[PDB]
Amino acid sequence: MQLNPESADLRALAKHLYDSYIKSFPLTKAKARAILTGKTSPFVIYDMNSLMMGEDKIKFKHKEVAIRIFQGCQFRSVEAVQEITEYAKSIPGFVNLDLNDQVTLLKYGVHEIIYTMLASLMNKDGVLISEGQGFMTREFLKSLRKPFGDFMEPKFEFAVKFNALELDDSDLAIFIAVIILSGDRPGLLNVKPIEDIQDNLLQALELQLKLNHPESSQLFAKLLQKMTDLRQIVTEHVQLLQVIKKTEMSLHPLLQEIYKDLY
Numbered sequence: 433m434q435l436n437p438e439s440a441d442l443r444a445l446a447k448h449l450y451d452s453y454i455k456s457f458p459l460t461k462a463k464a465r466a467i468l469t470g471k472t473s474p475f476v477i478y479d480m481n482s483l484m485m486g487e488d489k490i491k492f493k494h495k496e497v498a499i500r501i502f503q504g505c506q507f508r509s510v511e512a513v514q515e516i517t518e519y520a521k522s523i524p525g526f527v528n529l530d531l532n533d534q535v536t537l538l539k540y541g542v543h544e545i546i547y548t549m550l551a552s553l554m555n556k557d558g559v560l561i562s563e564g565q566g567f568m569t570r571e572f573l574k575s576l577r578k579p580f581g582d583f584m585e586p587k588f589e590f591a592v593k594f595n596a597l598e599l600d601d602s603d604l605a606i607f608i609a610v611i612i613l614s615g616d617r618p619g620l621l622n623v624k625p626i627e628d629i630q631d632n633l634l635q636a637l638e639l640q641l642k643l644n645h646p647e648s649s650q651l652f653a654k655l656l657q658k659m660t661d662l663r664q665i666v667t668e669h670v671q672l673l674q675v676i677k678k679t680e681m682s683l684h685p686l687l688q689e690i691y692k693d694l695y
């Protein structure tokens with residue numbers, strides 16, 4: 433690499449995305465990791481008893497336990513779509529795209545971003561819930577009645593391998609922008625303007641990674657592969673949502689909208 437006006441713009445892009453990311457997402461990976469390691473204290477949900485006690489202790493913003501959990505994830509999920517929408521709008525050039533492509537991008541992109549960021553809140557033992565007020569265990573989740581015990585496990589599997597990459601918020605800010613700016617979403621009007629934004633974002637990501645991670649040369653290439661993996665996770669998940677919606681089925685109507693064309 434070289435220091436030129438082009439690289440300097442790539443760094444300013446990265447700073448700008450990082451600053452928006454801090455504005456849009458109140459629970460950052462930095463914050464989540466400090467909660468997780470204990471240097472900063474969440475109520476842990478590890479069994480049916482602690483689940484009930486935690487519902488008492490945790491002031492939630494938003495009837496059988498697996499359904500209650502499903503609803504919590506649905507409301508968390510719609511809150512995430514608002515945050516991700518606010519962030520997308522800060523991606524330079526995004527608001528100048530046709531409003532229809534903006535929504536198409538967000539529609540096909542939000543779950544990939546959701547699972548990416550979910551990894552930030554996970555370790556091998558569990559996941560942060562309710563802005564870090566609670567911690568729900570991987571095995572408590574695996575123990576929920578068929579078929580709810582299989583929803584979260586692939587997210588945990590993805591997350592332990594993803595978290596071993598040791599990305600930080602600065603890396604993630606650009607990673608997430610690349611994902612939002614995918615010119616290959618169905619029903620896109622003007623693909624070329626999107627592809628131009630992404631190639632630039634991609635340059636900014638590759639520079640950021642080289643600078644921020646001297647211990648690995650393979651990181652950019654592994655990240656590209658992670659984006660493909662995320663599409664599988666969303667795919668696997670919507671199907672699991674199909675072969676379950678045949679037994680209950682309150683699905684949030686905003687989520688219903690997003691899922692229908694994902695189906």
Ligand SMILES: Cc1oc(-c2ccccc2)nc1CCOc1cccc(Cc2nn(-c3ccccc3)nc2CC(=O)O)c1
Pocket residue numbers: 492498500501502503504505506508509546550559560561562568573576580581583584673687
């Ligand atoms: C594991 C968990 O639980 C809670 C929580 C509980 C009570 C109150 C408040 C929060 N927060 C988290 C942490 C964020 O997880 C999320 C966040 C976004 C999307 C999903 C996928 C999903 N996963 N499920 C699901 C259903 C039942 C069991 C396990 C998972 N539903 C969905 C919804 C969707 O598919 O759209 C999970």
